[PDB]
Amino acid sequence: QTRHVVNFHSRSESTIENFMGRAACVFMDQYKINGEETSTDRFAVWTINIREMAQLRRKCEMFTYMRFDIEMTMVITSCQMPVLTHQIMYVPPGGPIPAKVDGYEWQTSTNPSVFWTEGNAPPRISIPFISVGNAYSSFYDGWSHFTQDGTYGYTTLNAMGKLYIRHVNRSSPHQITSTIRVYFKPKHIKAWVPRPPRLCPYINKRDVNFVVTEITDSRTSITD
């Protein structure tokens, strides 16, 4: 490459909606169709949070507070029959969860769910700003239980819900193993209180713990 005259004047790509509002795959999971009537491998879960993969997690930690609608579009495949129909049930933060693929929670009228049959365009489900407070908090320097009990750093304001996914087909002659890819996207996003970027690598998906990392890459002397 060579250093060219990069002559233009634009910061439309540096706004918050043009920086955060990009769809990224945040959840791959397998789920079968038949066998093991009491099993946990016939549906998917994915509690919705921004701390899924470190590339997106890093961008949400530029800012302390942010509020945004989310608009996820699943991309569902299958392996190994009839034409298959799926169900992507979003439960709110206050919502019952299934324990099995044939639980009664799947029939709850307050849990919105899409019934996508195979071959069409991917299913898209949009979720508004659910939180109780006025913004989602990326960081919470505080304790969930009063009087400095356990569970540091986890507030219940930035709870977004869960996403239970199953086949609606009751059975099949052979085994069908479906794969789902959830494409998370912030929408109509506002952000408050900027914050310095992450320096150290991430350890765990529910905490801010880190190993002490060097500031920059080292060089030989101060003058070279």
Partner 1 sequence: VRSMTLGNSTITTQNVVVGYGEWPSYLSTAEDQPTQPDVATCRFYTLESVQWEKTSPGWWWKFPEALKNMGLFGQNMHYHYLGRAGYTIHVQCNASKFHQGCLLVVCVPEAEMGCADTDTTFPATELTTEDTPHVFTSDSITGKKVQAAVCNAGMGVGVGNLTIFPHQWINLRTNNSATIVIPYINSVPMDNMFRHYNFTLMIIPFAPLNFTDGATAYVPITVTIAPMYAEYNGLRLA
Partner 2 sequence: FCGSAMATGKLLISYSPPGASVPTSRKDAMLGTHIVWDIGLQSSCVLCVPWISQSSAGYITCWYQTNIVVPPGAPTSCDVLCFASACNDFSVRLLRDTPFMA
Q: Do residues 111 and 206 touch, judged by C-beta distance below 8 A? A: no
- Nearest partner of 91 among 114, 72, 69, 110, judged by Cα: 110
Residue among 20 and 33 whose Cβ is closer to partner 1: 20
Q: Which of partner 1, partner 2, none sits in contact with 10, Cβ below 5 to 8 A by type?
A: partner 2
Pick the closer one to partner 1 by CB: 66 or 125: 66
The rounded radius of gyration (Å) of the Cα atoms in the chain is 22
Residue 137: closest CA among 63, 190, 196, 72: 63
Question: Considering only CA atoms, which of 150, 128, 131, 136 is closest in space to residue 70?
Answer: 128
By CB under 8 A, tell whether 193 contacts partner 1: yes
Interface with partner 1, residue 9, by CB under 8 A: yes
Q: And the tokens for 87?
A: 């169900």
68 binds partner 1 (CB under 8 A): no
> Would you say 151 and 144 are in contact if contact means Cβ atoms under 8 Å apart?
yes
User: Could you tell me the smallest distance in angstroms from the CB atom of residue 159 to partner 1?
Assistant: 13
Q: How far is the CB of 124 from partner 2 (least distance, A)?
A: 23
Q: Is 49 helix (H, G, I), strand (E, B) or coil?
A: coil
Q: Give residues in contact with partner 2 (CB under 8 A).
A: 1, 3-6, 8-11, 13-14, 18-19, 22, 54-55, 58, 198, 201, 223
Which sign, positive or negative, has the C-alpha torsion 137, 123, 113, 179?
A: negative
What does 140 bind: partner 2, partner 1, none (CB cut-off 5 to 8 Å by kind)? partner 1
Q: Pattern of binders to partner 1 over 78-107, x per CB under 8 A? A: ------------------------------
Min separation Cβ 29 and partner 1, Å: 25
As a whole number of angstroms, the distance between CA 107 and CA 72 comes to 22
- Give the interface with partner 1 as residue ranges (CB under 8 A): 2-5, 7, 9, 64-65, 132-137, 139-150, 152-153, 157, 192-200, 203-204, 207-215
